[PDB]
Amino acid sequence: VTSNHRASDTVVCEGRPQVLNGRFMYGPLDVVTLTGEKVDVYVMTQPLSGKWIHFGTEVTNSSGRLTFPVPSERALGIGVYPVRMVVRGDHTYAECCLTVVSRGTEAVVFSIDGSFTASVSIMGSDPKVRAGAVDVVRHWQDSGYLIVYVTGRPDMQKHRVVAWLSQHNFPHGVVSFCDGLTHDPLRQKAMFLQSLVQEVELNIVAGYGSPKDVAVYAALGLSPSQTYIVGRAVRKLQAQCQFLSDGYVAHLGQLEAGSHS
Numbered sequence: 107v108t109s110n111h112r113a114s115d116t117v118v119c120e121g122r123p124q125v126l127n128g129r130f131m132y133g134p135l136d137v138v139t140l141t142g143e144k145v146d147v148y149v150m151t152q153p154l155s156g157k158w159i160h161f162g163t164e165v166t167n168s169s170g171r172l173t174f175p176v177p178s179e180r181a182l183g184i185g186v187y188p189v190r191m192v193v194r195g196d197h198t199y200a201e202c203c204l205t206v207v208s209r210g211t212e213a214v215v216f217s218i219d220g221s222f223t224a225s226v227s228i229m230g231s232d233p234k235v236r237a238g239a240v241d242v243v244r245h246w247q248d249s250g251y252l253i254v255y256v257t258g259r260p261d262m263q264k265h266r267v268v269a270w271l272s273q274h275n276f277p278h279g280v281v282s283f284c285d286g287l288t289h290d291p292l293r294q295k296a297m298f299l300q301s302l303v304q305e306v307e308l309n310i311v312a313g314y315g316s317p318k319d320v321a322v323y324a325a326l327g328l329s330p331s332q333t334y335i336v337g338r339a340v341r342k343l344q345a346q347c348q349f350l351s352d353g354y355v356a357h358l359g360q361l362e363a364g365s366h367s
Contacts, residue, residue, distance in 0.1 A: 107133045111140075111200035112264045113191050115280045117254075119209050119306045120184055124176040128191045128200050129261065130166050136262050136286070139170040143195050147174050149204065150188040158190065182206050186278075205252075205280055209307045213252035215299060216243060217315030217322065218267075219259070222276070226316055226337055231266065235274045236336070238354030242314070244277050245361050251311065253279030254302070256295045256322075260286030292318060296325045320346050331367050 113128035126147060132138030143166050148158040164174045172191070176182070184206050192199040220226040224234040247253050255276075259267060261283035268281065284294045302308045303326060313323040317337040324333075324346070333347035334357070343349040348366075350357045360366050 107138055109193070109196075109198035110134065110136065110262065110265065111191070111193070111198060112261045112283075113189060113200040113202035114261075115202050115205065115282065116189075117205040117207060117280050117302065117306050117308070119211075120206050122306070123178070124181055124204065124206070126174045126176065126189060126191070126202070126204065128172045128174075128202075130170045130172065130193060130198075130200070131262070139168075140166050140193065141168050141170060142166060143193060145172055146192045146194055148190045148192065149176075149182070150190075151182065153185065153187055163194075184208055203278075203280075207252065207306065207308070210309050211252055211307075212250070212309045212311050213254050213302070214246045214312045215254045215256060215310055215314065215323075216279075217295065217313070217319040218255055218257045220316040221314055221319070221336060222274075232270060232273075236354060238358050240274060240276055241358050242354045242361065243279075245358060246312075247277045247279075252308070253277055254299075254308075254310075255279050255281045256298065257281075257283055258291030258295065260284050262286050292322055295319075296322050299326050317343060323347075 109132060111130045116126055118124050130140035144163055146163050147161045149161050151159050161176060161180060162174060164172045166172050187204045189202050189204050190199055222236055222239045223229045224236050243253060257267060264283055282298050284291045303310060310326060312332045313328050314334045317335060320333060320335060330347050334350055335343055335347045336350050337343055
């Protein structure tokens with residue numbers, strides 16, 4: 107049965123302990139779990155070199171999970187580093203990035219579900235990408251903001267979601283998923299983002315999403331003027347956020363004009 111491993115994008119403020127997490131599973135729905143097996147951890151310390159450096163080894167636990175502390179002697183400085191976790195038993199692997207940021211680094215969050223998709227509501231395995239969404243994200247990255255993507259989907263679906271993001275040429279960013287265990291995705295998204303602010307000390311300056319995401323951003327203390335939302339309920343949404351009634355294309359026009367707040 108085919109591997110379905112996933113490693114979490116790690117974002118950490120420099121000077122802090124750096125920890126990589128992964129999960130090792132077999133089959134499309136996580137039917138088989140990889141337990142008590144060795145996984146070798148590689149980092150591409152020079153991100154453009156293509157050269158892998160062996161950092162260490164860990165063992166999966168009963169639910170297939172792995173947590174790897176980077177030895178402080180090998181801590182990475184500010185940057186974005188490709189990471190590969192390789193199961194020693196069958197040479198299967200998972201990939202992710204370690205993002206090291208300086209304290210107070212500024213970021214924009216995109217809550218993907220129904221926001222990057224043409225439909226606000228219905229998304230099957232490949233949905234149509236909403237018009238202008240890639241340009242809006244690329245705008246923010248070009249303006250110097252760290253791009254963070256959040257989704258309500260379980261990380262079991264990560265490989266396909268990332269292929270979808272790549273297929274449509276979305277900028278590279280931090281991608282975060284739900285654990286597939288509790289099924290309160292809004293709650294999961296909120297806590298992840300709060301950990302970003304409180305633990306890694308990000309300055310999240312703006313949030314994009316669908317009407318359900320408004321609570322997520324409210325929970326972070328983000329003001330209405332920093333909350334950019336697609337959808338249809340005009341009067342309801344106008345009261346709690348910046349409603350993009352015309353879609354992303356017109357909105358891109360306003361971003362480029364610097365008249366978005």
